[PDB]
Amino acid sequence: GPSVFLFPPKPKDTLMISRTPEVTCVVVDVSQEDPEVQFNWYVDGVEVHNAKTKPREEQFNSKYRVVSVLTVLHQDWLNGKEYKCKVSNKGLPSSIEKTISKAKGQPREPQVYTLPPSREEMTKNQVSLSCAVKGFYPSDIAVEWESNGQPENNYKTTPPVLDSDGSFFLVSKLTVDKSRWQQGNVFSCSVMHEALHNHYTQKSLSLSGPSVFLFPPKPKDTLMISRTPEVTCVVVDVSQEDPEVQFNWYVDGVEVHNAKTKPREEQFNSDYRVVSVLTVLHQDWLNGKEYKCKVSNKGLPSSIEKTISKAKGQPREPQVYTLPPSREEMTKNQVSLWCLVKGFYPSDIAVEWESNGQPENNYKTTPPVLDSDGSFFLYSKLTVDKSRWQQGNVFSCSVMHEALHNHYTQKSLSLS
Ligand SMILES: [Zn+2]
Ligand SMILES: [Zn+2]
Structure with missing residues (x-):
């Protein structure tokens, strides 16, 4: 049975006016007895004839893929026009049509904060520099690092995570040699999001049919x-x-x-x-x-x-580090406390927050993210009123993971 997927442009193509954003229409499981595959494309219901249809790819199973790519205009995509792929193939009965557009709703501007490495991480050979982005809508965003004009490529960014107010957050983690941090080097987190000025900002950081599912x-x-x-x-x-x-x-x-x-x-x-x-x-x-x-x-x-079953492989103990707010966040009513957890395998984990023996429930956690060494990391973000933070109240990140002692650790975080 042939199926149809429709993918939106990549966020950074839609945000930089010199690149060529495109939507891609993909037909999977095309039998060899039956192409040809016809593509009709609609922009707000008007046919458009510019689309480019590649030759058929082999799949790993001897059926074919056929991809049609429509370049779309920086404005139209951000102005939320609807792109309809219709797919006509004998041995499809009739026609599968999918429609895509950008998410609707007033854009929100991200607040971007850089957070240094935790003092506890200052005994390792490498150290983790963070870029919290939060409060953005819609969720399309591209994050990059650089130093001194050069791309810094040793970074992993979490996907966007819906927060309680209907806006998204993510954290980006750049790993660098500590000597570089300790020598004064200056590192910049480059965010592109539609609701920034010029869709662009940079912040700097430097030493101060019945189917079956089986769930785990x-x-x-x-x-x-x-x-x-x-x-x-x-x-x-x-x-x-x-x-x-x-x-x-x-x-x-x-x-x-x-x-x-x-x-x-x-x-x-x-x-x-x-x-x-x-x-x-x-x-x-x-x-x-x-x-x-x-x-x-x-x-x-x-x-x-x-x-x-549980994922196979040598369990790896997480490193748990709490990060206080960015100084630049201290001009808000409410402030972000960070628990970076990294270097864990397998990905199965639980994080929670408490203060003074009471659960703090106003927190979101990122999904585990595959790091380059095969371990996973995430962040958890607890947002508290700032008076509580400046009164010196003490917050704990509780982390449960098979490879900790008793499968549990807690780290504290209070005003320095
Ligand atoms: Zn624009
Ligand atoms: Zn056990």
């Missing part, structure tokens, strides 16, 4: 031995005409019988979802046992098996 347990369940980690097998789009749905569960190939199936849950389209939940022992999950859910139903041809 929640990380915090897997890391505190007093909770009950569980795998979840979900059958989706079950026809009213055909349950019953039977579940079979295997732990490294041995059937177990301790799974609890729920009653069918109504979906938004009048087919059903069935969920079976299998508790797992803390020591089995961390030790790498494989959980197989087999699903059987008459709306299927025979069976669907999914296998999940």
Whole structure:
């Protein structure tokens, strides 16, 4: 069955007026018995004939991909015009049309702050320089570093993360040799976002069909031995005409019988979802046992098996470092406290915040981000009133991860 994806321009092409933003239309799983693939393109419903259609690519499975690319105008894309790819191919019945546009809503301007390395990181050979960007909308953004006119390429940026006020934040982490930091070198975080002046700013930093899903347990369940980690097998789009749905569960190939199936849950389209939940022992999950859910139903041809397990590889202990606000943030009502956690494997982690023995719930965390050494890092951002920060109140970042002692650490952060 041939499918259609439509991808938006890359953010930095849409933000720099000298580059050529393009939307790409991609047809996957084109059988060899049947191209040709016809592309029609619409801008706000007006055909446009300029699109360029590449020759068909081989996939790893002997069916073809066909990509059509439409360059779009810096203004039109930012002014939120709609690009419609229609795809006509015999052995598709009819036509698949996808529409894309930029996200709607008043743009918001990012606040960009650079944050130095934590004193605790000043014993390593390398040190981490941060660029918090927050308060931006929409989420399209490109971040880059430089020093002294030269690209600094040793950086990883988190994807944008929705915050409580409907705006996004991310953090960018540039890794440098400490001597360079310690010698005075000047480092700049280059942000491009539509709602900046000239879409550009720079801040400097220098020494002061029924389908099956199988979900893994929640990380915090897997890391505190007093909770009950569980795998979840979900059958989706079950026809009213055909349950019953039977579940079979295997732990490294041995059937177990301790799974609890729920009653069918109504979906938004009048087919059903069935969920079976299998508790797992803390020591089995961390030790790498494989959980197989087999699903059987008459709306299927025979069976669907999914296998999940914990990611394989030598666990790596995280380094947890708290960062106080940027000085430039101190002119706000509310201020950002940072927990950088880095150098952890596998990616399964939980972060939380507390002060004075009470949970602080006004925080978002980034997803784990793959670093270049194969470890993961993220940041967590707690936003507190500034009076609390300047009164000297003490904040703790709690980090749960298999490779810590007891699977837990806390770092404090208070006014210097
Ligand atoms: Zn512009
Ligand atoms: Zn344990």
